[PDB]
Amino acid sequence: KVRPSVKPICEKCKVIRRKGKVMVICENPKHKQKQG
Amino acid sequence: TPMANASTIERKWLVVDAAGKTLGRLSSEVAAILRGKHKPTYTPHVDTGDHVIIINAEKIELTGKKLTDKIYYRHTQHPGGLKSRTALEMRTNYPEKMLELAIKGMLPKGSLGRQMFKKLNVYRGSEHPHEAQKPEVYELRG
Amino acid sequence: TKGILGRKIGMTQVFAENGDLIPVTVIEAAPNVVLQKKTAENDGYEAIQLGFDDKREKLSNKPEKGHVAKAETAPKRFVKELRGVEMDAYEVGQEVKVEIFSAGEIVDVTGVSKGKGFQGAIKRHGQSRGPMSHGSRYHRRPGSMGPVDPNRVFKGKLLPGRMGGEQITVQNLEIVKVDAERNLLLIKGNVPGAKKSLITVKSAVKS
């Protein structure tokens, strides 16, 4: 997904700032977010 | 009645090596020489150019992201027919248009920004056929 | 890429091998003479000038009389390059002719089109006529130039002009036969250029 309020949902989600974009990466692939 | 020269001016060929230099801080150091901001017989309308042959046109660095984020724009007179291009395409394919566009952006435009620009040459490093004029090496002021 | 050049004559129908019917051109293009070998050791690029359809000496000049001295033949009207053949198998003075081609060689063909003269906006660009009735006076004409705010005509707005006279490549043809007995090509389809104009018969860019 893509949204300006990128947050982890469950505690299995890491928040990794790639490429100037605060991306959240997790196990479950419905957590997959980005502001961009 | 101060002095103002006319057709008694002697022109002296130079060489600037752009190797570990930015774009960018030497254009404003080649423009002032092409326009003649160092000869004391400086009368602004009389083509005072001791002029520069640039060597190592293939070697120019420029800081920041600006190989890929600085982009040229050469729009035609046809509608929406601009052909833009990044600096990395211009550093590889032909930088002879990189520096000559830079100096042409420096100079006062008109009929001197042609005549100051007819003085400049750019050669890709380091070969240039100007043996028969012997340019002294202008190291830069920085 | 092989390529010869020459006049054409006209159109025919030649059926072959089936009940077919083939639209066939007739080309006079034999034989070419290699007059000058453009070399990348001197000029940067690789080409071969070919001359065709020799003329009598009243029509040829001393700058051009001496130009055929390297091939040592008569003066010759129609000269063009060809970038750029497999290097080389040619010598300056070797009479290139029809023998290369065959029934199956896919071939692009270039030539200077039939000039029709000064023609208007429908015929020159395929533009469409307005209404021919209903009181309308606007017919046969190109109509609206552009908007109002830029206050000018954008470059490229189609208009009347002189139609024709360009050089047109027409691709992917099929050379039908080879007639080195009569100096005659045979190409499927329509080939641009008016009657008896000059036509360069290349080999194509495939596939």
């Binding site: - | 002095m3 160092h38 004391p40 017989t41 | -």
Partner: protein, 58 residues
């Protein structure tokens, strides 16, 4: 002529922003700026004034 001072003051390694401080101190020189220029027509008369500048630049 302010350009025609820097085109001579930089031959001797100074800047107009510093040179016209030098003439204001070493000397109270009220030299005409066309004529501290002219001091170029007959160089190195200007440099010997630029020599007078550097002594109070230290």
């Amino acid at each position: 002529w302010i350009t025609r001072i820097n085109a001579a003051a930089r031959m001797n390694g100074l800047s107009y922003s510093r040179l016209m401080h030098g003439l204001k101190l070493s000397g109270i020189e009220v030299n005409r700026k066309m004529l501290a220029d002219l001091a170029v027509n007959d160089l190195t008369a200007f440099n010997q004034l630029a020599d007078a500048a550097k002594a109070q630049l230290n």
